Design a protein around this ligand. Sequence first.
Ligand SMILES: Nc1ncnc2c1ncn2[C@@H]1O[C@H](COP(=O)(O)OP(=O)(O)O)[C@@H](O)[C@H]1O
Ligand SMILES: Nc1ncnc2c1ncn2[C@@H]1O[C@H](COP(=O)(O)OP(=O)(O)O)[C@@H](O)[C@H]1O
Ligand SMILES: [Mg+2]
Ligand SMILES: [Mg+2]
Ligand SMILES: [Mg+2]
Ligand SMILES: [Mg+2]
Ligand SMILES: [Mg+2]
Ligand SMILES: [Mg+2]
Lengths: 352, 352
Amino acid sequence: SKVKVAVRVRPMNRREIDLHTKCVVDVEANKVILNPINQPKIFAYDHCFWSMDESVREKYAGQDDVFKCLGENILQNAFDGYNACIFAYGQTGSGKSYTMMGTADQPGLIPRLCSGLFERTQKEENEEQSFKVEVSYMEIYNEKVRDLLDPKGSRQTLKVREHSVLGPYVDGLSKLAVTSYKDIESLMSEGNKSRTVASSRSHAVFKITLTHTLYDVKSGTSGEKVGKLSLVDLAGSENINKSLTTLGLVISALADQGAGKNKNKFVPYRDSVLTWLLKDSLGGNSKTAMVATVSPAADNYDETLSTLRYADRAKHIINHAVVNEDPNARIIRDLREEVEKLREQLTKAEAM
Amino acid sequence: SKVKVAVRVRPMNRREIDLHTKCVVDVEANKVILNPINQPKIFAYDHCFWSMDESVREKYAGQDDVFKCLGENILQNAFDGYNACIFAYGQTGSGKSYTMMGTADQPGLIPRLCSGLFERTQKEENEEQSFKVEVSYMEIYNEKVRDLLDPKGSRQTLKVREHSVLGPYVDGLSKLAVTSYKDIESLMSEGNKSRTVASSRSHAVFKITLTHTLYDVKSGTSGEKVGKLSLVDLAGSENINKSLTTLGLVISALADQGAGKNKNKFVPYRDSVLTWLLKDSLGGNSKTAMVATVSPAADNYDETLSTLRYADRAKHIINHAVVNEDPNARIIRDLREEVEKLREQLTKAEAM
Ligand SMILES: Nc1ncnc2c1ncn2[C@@H]1O[C@H](COP(=O)(O)OP(=O)(O)O)[C@@H](O)[C@H]1O
Ligand SMILES: Nc1ncnc2c1ncn2[C@@H]1O[C@H](COP(=O)(O)OP(=O)(O)O)[C@@H](O)[C@H]1O
Ligand SMILES: [Mg+2]
Ligand SMILES: [Mg+2]
Ligand SMILES: [Mg+2]
Ligand SMILES: [Mg+2]
Ligand SMILES: [Mg+2]
Ligand SMILES: [Mg+2]
């Protein structure tokens, strides 16, 4: 598990069509080549989604093209009891919301994972397996946390705590159990609503929990696997930017390790509430992926190079995803083997 | 744990006031004495709620008097990880719904346990304990099962199955996670609505699940206790009555055991879907209680004696309530003690 990095290129926006601004980005399979405005810097990633002109065949990547490559991965991960995570990263206007959430006519990953999760939760209920789904949705702005699923609209601040069983958590963040996609969307389109202005410097964290119960009908016992999917919508990469810049720190420190540099210096998860809550999604117990979104416009070249050079560093982060099973089952297994080993040493010592 | 039996006496109804029908029931502490219409048969129970004339002091038992004696018990039971159960039993008009559910101005046990459960769930959230609450509400009529929390109103039939991990269950019965009393009451007043007519030969089962999570902040581990409360509203005791009469069978077979009669003949839980689903609430893993409701009217004397003689038999049923913890924790505990015992026998046999 190294962090999987996609790059998505959006179409030229209206001003750029009018001004006939020049394309400096191009895509060749999984390579994206940053041309000079006038040296052409070339980067390679896991995927490269060219979303520039719909009227193409082999090239165009629409929203369900993005979902087959990434949403289908994180979905499989959940059912196998993994923590998964997708960050959208890049400048304002480059397309972070379109990819995460989409528009009403072009749904992004979040409505498509939700739709496809209940479609697969419903298809595998079978008297040996059940599934409970909880959902949470928090926004972070100015290093404060708000609950976007709060129906009273308080926009109250919730404090972050640490825990020896949960880890860092937001105290009083609602987790809403949900049984159909219509349950969430009737809370969560109001969560996309309840977002600040002056609007692009806040991060949205959407977290879905899948509890997979499994039944040993022969043994009569039951266990539970839990996956957690976190869909993270960052502020624009272009005390208001403490989280974003700390997230810069933490991606380089990690990318340096595995590359074997500063193996002994500690990753500063602690400093911003964003890096500290997503501690585990960054070099921890998480199948994590990143979507660097870029504008192809030549007027954006500098933030585009920033974003391509973050995306290139994040691909060197090593993850430690394990399956969130029950500690006890393996403790019993190894205790029983000591009993068997010790019972043999007993009859291997009666002869004395 | 023997089954706890209350008797509740309702006021004379309108016809009985007009006709000045005579009271044949009287209550002395926990004894209720059935006078002759014209031998006065006397029975003793755990409680005796005289709800006949409100204008009394030492005698009257109103709805919160009933709840302090019984609802508070079943509530404590749940938080300690027990299965609990209250059956209301008796003839039509004797007061089974008033006691279980009550009227809008006189709430019964079910709204008062719900109110008091969230009031105590909210008072003990404390970063070492959390609580998840699920709820289900099924009706049984003509040995078919309907879901009273089904919002489409299908009134579809759901089949009963057996299971080696769940036991007998109703397949496709919704279990709705709920976070406040207003969540349930906005589904469940519609469940009291969706009930048949021609109306008094159906049983309502209201089942609330309390999942108590506990955190070992020193050990960093987590366990879950689960209580189940079943609030059962029977048909009137006066293929439509298969469940009710089978429930008669099953209460006598059980009451005979412990009294040591027919120890070898098997309790016929299997025959009706009511006795088979509530198998465990009858002589099984349940802190179970029964409320025999009676009319004081002399025109009801015969069903009153029936009901008092059921209530007297049910008090001899023995329950086997255990705390629904994790099998594994005790399996580890005993495995570790064998390792310690076997390590000593090893150094108690090196000397040979
Ligand atoms: N691939 C795309 N295809 C069509 N429209 C897009 C695409 N990407 C972005 N857009 C549109 O361009 C604007 C990009 O803004 P947005 O995606 O909200 O970016 P961010 O949140 O990253 O600033 C939005 O109005 C979006 O709907
Ligand atoms: N203790 C009581 N105090 C006042 N009214 C009662 C009492 N018990 C019953 N009633 C009223 O008498 C009628 C009894 O019917 P109900 O309780 O529905 O009985 P069941 O469901 O047992 O037939 C109801 O209308 C109820 O509201
Ligand atoms: Mg955005
Ligand atoms: Mg996650
Ligand atoms: Mg960018
Ligand atoms: Mg009734
Ligand atoms: Mg029960
Ligand atoms: Mg009666």
